[PDB]
Amino acid sequence: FKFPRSYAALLADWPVVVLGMCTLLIVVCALVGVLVPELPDFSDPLLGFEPRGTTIGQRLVTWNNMMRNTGYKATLANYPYKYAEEQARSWNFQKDSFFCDVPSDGYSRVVFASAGGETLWNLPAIKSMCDVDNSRIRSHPQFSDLCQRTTAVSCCPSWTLGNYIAILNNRSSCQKIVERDVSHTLKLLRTCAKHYQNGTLGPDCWCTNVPRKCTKYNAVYQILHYLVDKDFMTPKTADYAVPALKYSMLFSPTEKGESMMNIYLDNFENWNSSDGITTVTGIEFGIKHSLFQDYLLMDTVYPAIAIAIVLLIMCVYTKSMFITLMTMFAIISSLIVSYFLYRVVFNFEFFPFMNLTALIILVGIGANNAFVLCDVWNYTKFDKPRAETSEAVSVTLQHAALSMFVTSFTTAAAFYANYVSNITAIRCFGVYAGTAILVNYVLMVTWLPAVIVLHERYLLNIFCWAVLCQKCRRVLFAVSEASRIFFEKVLPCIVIKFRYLWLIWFLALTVGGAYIVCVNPKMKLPSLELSEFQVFRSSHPFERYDAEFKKLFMFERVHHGEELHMPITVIWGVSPEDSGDPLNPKSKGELTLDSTFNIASPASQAWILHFCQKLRNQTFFHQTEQQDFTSCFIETFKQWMENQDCDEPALYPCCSHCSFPYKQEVFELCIKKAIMELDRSTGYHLNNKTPGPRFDINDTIRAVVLEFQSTFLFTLAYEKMQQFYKEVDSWISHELSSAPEGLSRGWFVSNLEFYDLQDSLSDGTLIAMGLSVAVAFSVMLLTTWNIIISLYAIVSIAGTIFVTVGSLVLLGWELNVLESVTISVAVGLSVNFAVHYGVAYRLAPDPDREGKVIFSLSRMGSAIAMAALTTFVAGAMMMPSTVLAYTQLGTFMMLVMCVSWAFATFFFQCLCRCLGPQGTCGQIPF
Ligand SMILES: CC(C)CCC[C@@H](C)[C@H]1CC[C@H]2[C@@H]3CC=C4C[C@@H](OC(=O)CCC(=O)O)CC[C@]4(C)[C@H]3CC[C@]12C
Ligand SMILES: CC(C)CCC[C@@H](C)[C@H]1CC[C@H]2[C@@H]3CC=C4C[C@@H](OC(=O)CCC(=O)O)CC[C@]4(C)[C@H]3CC[C@]12C
Ligand SMILES: CC(C)CCC[C@@H](C)[C@H]1CC[C@H]2[C@@H]3CC=C4C[C@@H](OC(=O)CCC(=O)O)CC[C@]4(C)[C@H]3CC[C@]12C
Ligand SMILES: CC(C)CCC[C@@H](C)[C@H]1CC[C@H]2[C@@H]3CC=C4C[C@@H](OC(=O)CCC(=O)O)CC[C@]4(C)[C@H]3CC[C@]12C
Ligand SMILES: CC(C)CCC[C@@H](C)[C@H]1CC[C@H]2[C@@H]3CC=C4C[C@@H](OC(=O)CCC(=O)O)CC[C@]4(C)[C@H]3CC[C@]12C
Ligand SMILES: CC(C)CCC[C@@H](C)[C@H]1CC[C@H]2[C@@H]3CC=C4C[C@@H](OC(=O)CCC(=O)O)CC[C@]4(C)[C@H]3CC[C@]12C
Ligand SMILES: CC(C)CCC[C@@H](C)[C@H]1CC[C@H]2[C@@H]3CC=C4C[C@@H](OC(=O)CCC(=O)O)CC[C@]4(C)[C@H]3CC[C@]12C
Ligand SMILES: CC(C)CCC[C@@H](C)[C@H]1CC[C@H]2[C@@H]3CC=C4C[C@@H](OC(=O)CCC(=O)O)CC[C@]4(C)[C@H]3CC[C@]12C
Ligand SMILES: CC(C)CCC[C@@H](C)[C@H]1CC[C@H]2[C@@H]3CC=C4C[C@@H](OC(=O)CCC(=O)O)CC[C@]4(C)[C@H]3CC[C@]12C
Ligand SMILES: CC(C)CCC[C@@H](C)[C@H]1CC[C@H]2[C@@H]3CC=C4C[C@@H](OC(=O)CCC(=O)O)CC[C@]4(C)[C@H]3CC[C@]12C
Ligand SMILES: CC(C)CCC[C@@H](C)[C@H]1CC[C@H]2[C@@H]3CC=C4C[C@@H](OC(=O)CCC(=O)O)CC[C@]4(C)[C@H]3CC[C@]12C
Ligand SMILES: CC(C)CCC[C@@H](C)[C@H]1CC[C@H]2[C@@H]3CC=C4C[C@@H](OC(=O)CCC(=O)O)CC[C@]4(C)[C@H]3CC[C@]12C
Ligand SMILES: CC(C)CCC[C@@H](C)[C@H]1CC[C@H]2[C@@H]3CC=C4C[C@@H](OC(=O)CCC(=O)O)CC[C@]4(C)[C@H]3CC[C@]12C
Ligand SMILES: CC(C)CCC[C@@H](C)[C@H]1CC[C@H]2[C@@H]3CC=C4C[C@@H](OC(=O)CCC(=O)O)CC[C@]4(C)[C@H]3CC[C@]12C
Ligand SMILES: *[C@@H]1O[C@H](CO)[C@@H](O)[C@H](O)[C@H]1NC(C)=O
Ligand SMILES: *[C@@H]1O[C@H](CO)[C@@H](O)[C@H](O)[C@H]1NC(C)=O
Ligand SMILES: *[C@@H]1O[C@H](CO)[C@@H](O)[C@H](O)[C@H]1NC(C)=O
Ligand SMILES: *[C@@H]1O[C@H](CO)[C@@H](O)[C@H](O)[C@H]1NC(C)=O
């Protein structure tokens, strides 16, 4: 084909070649990306929330692998199974005055409130609950088969006040009851409220120290413990004029689980939840996460509206459909090419649901690039209106391709910085967004200028409804002038005239941000446990169950408030190595057994026994009065040997006669005898959790695990949990340094999964900050070449972070997973506005501060404002969503927009006006 002597001439001369080449290369990526890599799945929205490389993580996955692999013939067995061959060679309640069970979690249940009225205790509300149960749940066909029935005729009653009250007044059903029953039951509860709080009127009855009449169907306990707000009856029960019920819970005689999915979708999901007298306000059918997949897809409309509005804006700004359509096509196609790269070339086997949320980011920064290019192109068409097309292209690129790089590169580098995190979902998201930004940048340099050539080559030729078009052209020209004089005079006037106000005002706002984030109420690590994470909008009937009602109903409030000790576990022979893929959350290593290990050497037998007793002196050991003969198994073996009198040839190696550091071989024999005996000397059977030795397929000892209870208690609170971990690990890790060989390389673990996420979120955040700020500062130097300007730019950027993070703290964000990503992103999104003002301030020909800033503002203000405004409106478009991440990104985009725009237009322009380098002293040579 024909040859042009320059790239800017290839654009001018054969732009169609560029478009053909690019559309080909999009479409082959679309094809391979659809065909070859398996489709992403969000049926588990938590899937990659897992720190990997962390020492606690490697220990945990190793331990988890041991539990998984332990079992009969398989590797790392729990008994000496080869030796275990040798031992073989050697409805109407006034009849139906009972419930099919006492309810619990594991049943499907709902929580009622009322839209008005101060107590649910009134008869109409009671009847409303049993009515709406019938009308929403029992009315469904499938329920009749889901039921924990006793007969087909009427399968089983639910648990609700409406049923207990009936039995307690010998009525047939909820529909028969009267306010005499309600008052009589209220008298029962007001009498029996005191007994229940003590626990004297306990769960099992029909208790013993309490009047039998209070507890005849065992009912009172169940009512107060399951059905009713813990605040309904209290020590103030009689101090209340009448007790007030804010909430009640109702239990279906059907499972909490996937089986409910139809009934929810059928009868709950899009009802107004109400009869006014009552409202369902919490629901737990268990389907919370399994519904997510479907919900995410319903919400993608909001992203689609965001794109449709970003189109409209770019049309109005560019005065063409065509440039706006082909830019939008480029923006979209970059997600396809990057998706191809991410699955195929980079060979990542997993794609977090979060990556879809990067679309709404990338359309914002896509429009940002489109603005500065079309703007500078139009500057060339004004600065040099008569030009040859390739020359005009060249000078446009000489200007724009640099600035449009550093918008993009700083933002990509902020997303790739999240690859430093130990968390797989974050590392993946940080890479996908990073590539899609850079792919989009390449299209904005190759594809887009070719379209600008086509626009001048052809598209100007094409030209009541007959005049309303002209009305609009007139009016939009009027705003083009009003906006022009606003930027070219008014905004500079505002900034200079009140410079001193703007400086202290924004400065105080940053201190507010810094105080809020860093001291009070300090930015907090997540403290709902992972298996209960929020995924829907906080108003949503599922989220209110985990968020509010688990605090309020006694069985929940107690069961999740109960004390459990940390099972301090210590392990040897298995190495603490994770050999899985550090990005694919489906992958894990197997075991890796260590040839240096043994226990049968008498030196080991001595040291390990001694070590348990040393482990028994440490302050953190909870010395139970109950004795676990599997904790420190070797003691149990020692005393068993000592109990073993000898009167047979077979028992000579296992004689009590021998000194405790036994010969390795007789240890290796007698240990098998002792443990295989445990099926007979006790009824207890081992399982994969059970402490003790562990076996080869041919029952050499390959490993051993010991376990002990802490003084400490299980908690989600990072500080207390950290105190526990650091103490116990430090002591064990020190003490192991004393051990004879092979025991030299043990390690410790216990129920620490949620702690390791918290500890990995803070470090993963902070380091991705330090990295993203460092790169953002380097770009600031490399563009402005003036250390003074860069210092101010960095101060303003830092200020935006403190105000955004501070306001997100006040909005009540934990440092949970998505949120902890966004904080790095904020650095990338913030920096580019300060870069634009920075370069324009140097490029000002004016000799003085005021001239320099006036030039910078008048030159950039429109394009900056569009970048902010488009991103902001795209963000706002996510607000109506139902999925939390969509709304969470939404708030964040709006907020970081205003804040970064405000600091970049005001504060940064004070520091230039009020302190800017007008002498050359801040400048550095190439
Ligand atoms: C993502 C995909 C759908 C993008 C596909 C790009 C097309 C819409 C572009 C590529 C080349 C363009 C064409 C290049 C040349 C011409 C010839 C031109 O015809 C004339 O009458 C003038 C001919 C001349 O003197 O050059 C009108 C515009 C048109 C059809 C252009 C219309 C838009 C086209 C087909
Ligand atoms: C809620 C939204 C969807 C309604 C309002 C949006 C309009 C004000 C936008 C949408 C597309 C835009 C148009 C895209 C392309 C052109 C071609 C161009 O046509 C000409 O004949 C040149 C006239 C001139 O510039 O003087 C003039 C601008 C115009 C009408 C744009 C003006 C502003 C428009 C009508
Ligand atoms: C970066 C963006 C622009 C692209 C990201 C990849 C998408 C092309 C993937 C992500 C999730 C996928 C969806 C996940 C689930 C479903 C339900 C599925 O429903 C069925 O009836 C088939 C069920 C099955 O066999 O899996 C149809 C495909 C679809 C929409 C998938 C189509 C391809 C999707 C949209
Ligand atoms: C990873 C790959 C696929 C990206 C490829 C993109 C390039 C083809 C783009 C990026 C920036 C563009 C450049 C932006 C600015 C200029 C400067 C301009 O002027 C000079 O080079 C003057 C040199 C002199 O001083 O003599 C000529 C076009 C050129 C190189 C552009 C040509 C096309 C470039 C190299
Ligand atoms: C893997 C991909 C994403 C990397 C792509 C990087 C390039 C697009 C960068 C690297 C070096 C940059 C170039 C370094 C130096 C120059 C010379 C510069 O020449 C000028 O005339 C400067 C003075 C002036 O603007 O008047 C114009 C921009 C240009 C080509 C830069 C444009 C953007 C470039 C090609
Ligand atoms: C907008 C335009 C300029 C396209 C974007 C350019 C690049 C960002 C992409 C597009 C297709 C990619 C290529 C697709 C296929 C291959 C084959 C691949 O071959 C190997 O032997 C891979 C071995 C392996 O690592 O497994 C090497 C990378 C390469 C050239 C890729 C490098 C990056 C490319 C050039
Ligand atoms: C609920 C949703 C559907 C509401 C959508 C409202 C938008 C259509 C409004 C909100 C803000 C408006 C914008 C406010 C500021 C500007 C900048 C203004 O810029 C200039 O006039 C530049 C003139 C030039 O230099 O050529 C053009 C109109 C525009 C994009 C406005 C067009 C109409 C916008 C996008
Ligand atoms: C480089 C400067 C000039 C600009 C600002 C960037 C960072 C220094 C800021 C942004 C977000 C802040 C972080 C937000 C959240 C946390 C988690 C927080 O973790 C805790 O365990 C707090 C106590 C608890 O949760 O009980 C410790 C501080 C830290 C890293 C903050 C410290 C200061 C950070 C890293
Ligand atoms: C993904 C990798 C390739 C990124 C590497 C870091 C980039 C941010 C660096 C690499 C080369 C640098 C460029 C090398 C040379 C120059 C020329 C230098 O002087 C001029 O051209 C003056 C232009 C003007 O007056 O603004 C301006 C900075 C610039 C574009 C540098 C900007 C920052 C660049 C693109
Ligand atoms: C006042 C001027 C300066 C304009 C400010 C921006 C507005 C154009 C838009 C953008 C985002 C919008 C808000 C986005 C979300 C909501 C939440 C919505 O309320 C709820 O979701 C909470 C209901 C509850 O639980 O009480 C009420 C409208 C509101 C405040 C919107 C009101 C109009 C806002 C501020
Ligand atoms: C002018 C520019 C800035 C764009 C304006 C976008 C608006 C069209 C958005 C911003 C806030 C949105 C509102 C934010 C919150 C809600 C509550 C939401 O309440 C529900 O019942 C659904 C959620 C639930 O199930 O709890 C219904 C949509 C609505 C009114 C949204 C409708 C669309 C609004 C007004
Ligand atoms: C002149 C304008 C364009 C500049 C100032 C912009 C503000 C009006 C924006 C920036 C951030 C926005 C907020 C970002 C996040 C939220 C949370 C959102 O949800 C709730 O507040 C739910 C909980 C509650 O109701 O307390 C409601 C909208 C709100 C306050 C937004 C309202 C509009 C705000 C304050
Ligand atoms: C969403 C966040 C990131 C803020 C984005 C920047 C806005 C604050 C800018 C963009 C366009 C600006 C507007 C452009 C033009 C005008 C007309 C201007 O009109 C006059 O001064 C009066 C003229 C007369 O005499 O009739 C008043 C300010 C206003 C609304 C500007 C107010 C500030 C705006 C909305
Ligand atoms: C353009 C300039 C002025 C900077 C950007 C606008 C800020 C001043 C906005 C952006 C987000 C706003 C915050 C968004 C959410 C909230 C939560 C809201 O509720 C609470 O703090 C309740 C406190 C309590 O219960 O006592 C009060 C307003 C506040 C702090 C807002 C205060 C004003 C903020 C920081
Ligand atoms: C309860 O109802 C039954 C009839 O269904 C009746 O025999 C009985 O006397 C009633 N009263 C009591 C206290 O059980
Ligand atoms: C909607 O909610 C109100 C709450 O008062 C309730 O009265 C009404 O019956 C519900 N359903 C319909 C169809 O209006
Ligand atoms: C410390 O442990 C040894 C056995 O390891 C025991 O004899 C000694 O009494 C313990 N000391 C204290 C203070 O508990
Ligand atoms: C015993 O098991 C080990 C590892 O499982 C294996 O290498 C060895 O060959 C086995 N020996 C016999 C005799 O089964």
Side-chain angles (χ1 to χ4, degrees):
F1 190 76
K2 299 180 175 70
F3 178 73
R5 188 50 171 169
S6 172
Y7 182 86
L10 180 59
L11 282 173
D13 301 347
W14 295 289
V16 69
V17 171
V18 188
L19 280 83
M21 176 195 79
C22 286
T23 48
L24 171 163
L25 190 50
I26 301 315
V27 170
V28 67
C29 281
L31 289 169
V32 179
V34 164
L35 289 169
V36 173
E38 56 267 63
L39 294 182
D41 176 31
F42 323 126
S43 70
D44 180 3
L46 282 296
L47 184 62
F49 292 10
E50 171 183 78
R52 277 258 161 181
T54 47
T55 184
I56 296 173
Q58 297 199 49
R59 289 178 181 183
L60 280 163
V61 302
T62 302
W63 170 237
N64 194 39
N65 286 2
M66 295 166 66
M67 288 199 293
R68 199 182 76 194
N69 281 274
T70 300
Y72 196 55
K73 54 184 175 305
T75 191
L76 194 82
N78 211 2
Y79 288 91
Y81 282 107
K82 177 179 176 177
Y83 192 91
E85 306 190 343
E86 315 299 17
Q87 68 84 36
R89 301 185 179 98
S90 79
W91 189 265
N92 170 20
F93 280 99
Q94 66 162 220
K95 294 302 304 183
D96 310 329
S97 49
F98 40 80
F99 289 90
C100 313
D101 210 344
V102 60
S104 62
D105 56 341
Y107 291 95
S108 273
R109 52 208 186 270
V110 309
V111 174
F112 289 107
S114 300
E118 308 310 322
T119 184
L120 276 69
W121 189 262
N122 69 79
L123 178 149
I126 292 167
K127 285 197 174 180
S128 308
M129 294 190 286
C130 69
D131 173 31
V132 76
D133 170 11
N134 303 337
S135 306
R136 295 281 168 192
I137 295 173
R138 310 185 71 91
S139 57
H140 192 283
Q142 190 173 353
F143 164 85
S144 66
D145 302 338
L146 303 196
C147 181
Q148 291 194 6
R149 68 167 64 173
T150 65
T151 183
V153 178
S154 180
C155 83
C156 176
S158 52
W159 306 265
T160 171
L161 281 304
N163 293 354
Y164 281 102
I165 188 160
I167 176 175
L168 291 168
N169 296 271
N170 192 66
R171 312 307 192 193
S172 189
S173 71
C174 186
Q175 294 303 116
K176 299 306 302 183
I177 81 180
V178 297
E179 275 282 353
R180 195 174 188 159
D181 309 341
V182 178
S183 52
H184 179 65
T185 45
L186 187 71
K187 284 284 183 176
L188 251 294
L189 296 185
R190 282 244 265 202
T191 306
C192 301
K194 49 203 191 78
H195 309 306
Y196 165 73
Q197 287 170 103
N198 226 301
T200 317
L201 167 59
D204 299 7
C205 207
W206 160 236
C207 171
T208 189
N209 295 314
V210 180
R212 201 151 180 81
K213 71 181 184 179
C214 175
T215 184
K216 201 167 188 175
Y217 302 98
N218 197 17
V220 56
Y221 177 94
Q222 308 170 49
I223 291 159
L224 296 178
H225 197 75
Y226 302 111
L227 271 62
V228 169
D229 172 6
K230 75 183 180 60
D231 303 344
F232 174 63
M233 286 201 201
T234 69
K236 291 100 72 171
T237 290
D239 192 4
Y240 309 144
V242 66
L245 182 64
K246 294 297 193 291
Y247 306 106
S248 173
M249 198 177 316
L250 177 152
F251 298 80
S252 173
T254 65
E255 302 312 306
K256 178 198 72 172
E258 183 75 348
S259 190
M260 297 295 299
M261 180 69 82
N262 292 349
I263 304 101
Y264 178 76
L265 295 169
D266 294 347
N267 298 343
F268 288 91
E269 80 169 309
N270 53 18
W271 165 42
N272 84 10
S273 77
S274 306
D275 76 353
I277 308 174
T278 61
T279 53
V280 296
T281 55
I283 299 291
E284 196 190 75
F285 295 175
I287 70 182
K288 186 185 189 189
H289 295 164
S290 63
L291 182 64
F292 180 91
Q293 170 96 338
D294 187 22
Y295 251 67
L296 185 53
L297 268 53
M298 285 200 78
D299 275 353
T300 66
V301 298
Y302 301 115
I305 304 314
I307 287 155
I309 297 308
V310 174
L311 278 172
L312 184 188
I313 296 166
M314 293 205 303
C315 281
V316 172
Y317 198 77
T318 63
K319 76 146 60 176
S320 78
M321 75 297 281
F322 196 91
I323 303 169
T324 286
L325 262 62
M326 299 302 184
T327 43
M328 192 59 53
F329 177 85
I331 291 170
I332 293 302
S333 75
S334 73
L335 291 107
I336 303 308
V337 172
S338 55
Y339 175 78
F340 161 88
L341 286 171
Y342 174 94
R343 299 308 298 278
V344 178
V345 179
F346 292 119
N347 63 91
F348 294 9
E349 308 93 329
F350 157 64
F351 181 93
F353 90 90
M354 302 204 305
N355 280 4
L356 288 162
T357 82
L359 172 61
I360 311 98
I361 299 303
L362 181 57
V363 299
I365 177 160
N368 188 344
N369 287 344
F371 294 129
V372 300
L373 187 142
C374 81
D375 183 34
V376 160
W377 168 257
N378 291 340
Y379 280 0
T380 74
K381 294 200 302 171
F382 179 75
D383 297 340
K384 196 75 176 79
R386 181 68 284 127
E388 183 280 321
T389 300
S390 185
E391 197 289 322
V393 164
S394 308
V395 62
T396 305
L397 293 183
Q398 289 152 226
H399 298 178
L402 185 171
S403 57
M404 190 171 67
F405 179 75
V406 299
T407 52
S408 309
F409 172 65
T410 48
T411 301
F415 279 106
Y416 287 133
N418 292 116
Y419 183 77
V420 181
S421 179
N422 297 294
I423 296 171
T424 70
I426 294 184
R427 292 165 75 86
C428 290
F429 176 93
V431 169
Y432 179 61
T435 64
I437 296 279
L438 294 187
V439 173
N440 178 67
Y441 172 79
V442 177
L443 299 179
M444 296 300 150
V445 177
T446 64
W447 164 271
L448 173 58
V451 166
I452 302 308
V453 174
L454 295 183
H455 185 70
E456 79 160 24
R457 189 187 279 204
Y458 296 124
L459 302 184
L460 300 176
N461 306 0
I462 70 178
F463 308 104
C464 180
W465 170 97
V467 67
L468 181 61
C469 47
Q470 312 311 314
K471 301 290 190 75
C472 298
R473 290 169 189 194
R474 172 180 168 210
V475 169
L476 73 89
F477 175 82
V479 314
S480 82
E481 286 303 314
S483 63
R484 179 179 171 184
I485 192 162
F486 175 77
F487 290 117
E488 293 206 310
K489 197 181 72 169
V490 182
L491 174 62
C493 178
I494 297 168
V495 169
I496 290 183
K497 188 174 179 178
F498 311 116
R499 54 186 187 284
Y500 298 116
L501 179 165
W502 296 127
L503 180 55
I504 75 175
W505 171 264
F506 277 104
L507 180 62
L509 259 291
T510 67
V511 169
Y515 178 91
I516 290 290
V517 74
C518 211
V519 301
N520 168 43
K522 192 193 300 265
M523 173 56 136
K524 50 163 59 81
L525 273 289
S527 66
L528 281 303
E529 66 267 47
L530 182 147
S531 56
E532 304 202 332
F533 266 18
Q534 173 161 20
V535 300
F536 302 148
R537 197 183 181 98
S538 309
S539 53
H540 185 282
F542 296 171
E543 298 299 349
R544 297 194 68 189
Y545 194 77
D546 292 329
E548 296 161 66
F549 302 113
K550 280 185 179 153
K551 312 288 289 187
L552 302 187
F553 284 86
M554 198 70 85
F555 76 108
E556 300 277 23
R557 180 261 184 264
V558 173
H559 175 270
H560 309 293
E562 268 283 29
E563 71 186 39
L564 294 93
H565 309 91
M566 304 299 284
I568 299 155
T569 310
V570 196
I571 298 188
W572 286 266
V574 185
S575 64
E577 169 177 317
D578 178 14
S579 64
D581 179 283
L583 296 176
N584 177 3
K586 301 297 182 67
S587 81
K588 266 109 182 183
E590 301 204 331
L591 301 179
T592 291
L593 309 183
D594 189 331
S595 60
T596 62
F597 161 83
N598 79 83
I599 62 176
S601 55
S604 301
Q605 303 172 38
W607 183 92
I608 194 70
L609 170 64
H610 170 69
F611 173 90
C612 295
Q613 312 201 332
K614 290 207 53 179
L615 178 58
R616 278 185 166 91
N617 287 3
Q618 307 312 303
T619 56
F620 62 79
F621 169 52
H622 168 42
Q623 186 155 37
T624 52
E625 174 54 24
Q626 171 60 313
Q627 301 309 304
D628 171 13
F629 303 101
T630 74
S631 70
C632 195
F633 83 99
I634 198 167
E635 283 175 325
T636 302
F637 180 64
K638 177 173 191 290
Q639 69 78 42
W640 174 92
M641 277 291 296
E642 289 189 55
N643 275 268
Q644 192 56 66
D645 187 26
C646 270
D647 64 345
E648 283 201 22
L651 308 177
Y652 95 72
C654 313
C655 304
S656 181
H657 167 75
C658 291
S659 181
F660 162 66
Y662 310 117
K663 299 177 184 177
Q664 158 149 333
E665 50 268 73
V666 309
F667 171 89
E668 153 66 4
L669 289 175
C670 298
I671 191 65
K672 299 182 190 181
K673 303 201 181 198
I675 67 195
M676 86 179 181
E677 177 32 27
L678 210 54
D679 230 19
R680 293 137 178 163
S681 52
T682 78
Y684 186 74
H685 294 66
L686 290 50
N687 75 348
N688 63 347
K689 293 186 175 74
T690 296
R694 298 297 169 102
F695 291 99
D696 211 325
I697 68 184
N698 53 39
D699 74 28
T700 295
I701 309 307
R702 276 292 161 269
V704 58
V705 316
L706 307 185
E707 192 175 305
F708 305 94
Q709 305 306 327
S710 61
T711 45
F712 293 93
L713 294 176
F714 183 87
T715 179
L716 306 181
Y718 177 83
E719 288 287 14
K720 288 162 59 175
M721 189 51 73
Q722 178 147 292
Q723 177 186 18
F724 161 62
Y725 168 71
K726 291 188 69 175
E727 172 164 33
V728 175
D729 179 86
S730 67
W731 186 73
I732 293 171
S733 56
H734 174 71
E735 188 65 8
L736 278 167
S737 319
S738 73
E741 268 301 355
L743 286 177
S744 50
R745 321 168 43 74
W747 50 277
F748 134 75
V749 64
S750 64
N751 293 343
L752 227 58
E753 292 170 346
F754 191 76
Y755 171 72
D756 198 32
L757 173 60
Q758 293 174 329
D759 191 64
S760 186
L761 279 163
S762 60
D763 283 2
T765 299
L766 207 182
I767 304 302
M769 230 57 53
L771 179 58
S772 56
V773 172
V775 65
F777 184 71
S778 77
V779 169
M780 194 61 59
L781 270 305
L782 271 43
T783 48
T784 63
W785 282 85
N786 186 302
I787 199 164
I788 290 299
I789 295 182
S790 92
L791 279 200
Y792 302 137
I794 216 60
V795 173
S796 76
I797 288 157
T800 66
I801 307 311
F802 286 114
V803 177
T804 44
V805 184
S807 49
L808 293 163
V809 166
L810 283 160
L811 283 159
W813 287 23
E814 291 164 306
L815 187 65
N816 207 348
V817 173
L818 172 60
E819 300 93 323
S820 75
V821 185
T822 64
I823 306 169
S824 312
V825 180
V827 184
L829 273 285
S830 179
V831 58
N832 71 66
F833 294 163
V835 177
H836 289 174
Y837 289 118
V839 304
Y841 175 102
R842 163 162 61 77
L843 265 62
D846 305 39
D848 65 343
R849 282 162 172 184
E850 50 266 61
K852 291 180 187 298
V853 303
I854 287 165
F855 178 93
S856 76
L857 277 169
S858 57
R859 192 172 179 97
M860 299 314 299
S862 181
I864 282 284
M866 292 303 98
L869 180 69
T870 44
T871 305
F872 180 99
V873 173
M877 215 55 50
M878 303 306 301
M879 294 293 97
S881 60
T882 325
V883 169
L884 183 91
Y886 279 82
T887 88
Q888 272 181 347
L889 263 219
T891 51
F892 171 79
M893 289 172 78
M894 287 191 297
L895 184 44
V896 72
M897 268 318 98
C898 276
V899 177
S900 59
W901 176 81
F903 273 87
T905 47
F906 290 93
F907 176 94
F908 180 80
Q909 296 291 3
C910 184
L911 271 62
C912 299
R913 160 54 179 81
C914 63
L915 294 173
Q918 66 182 17
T920 191
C921 184
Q923 210 69 32
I924 298 181
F926 303 105

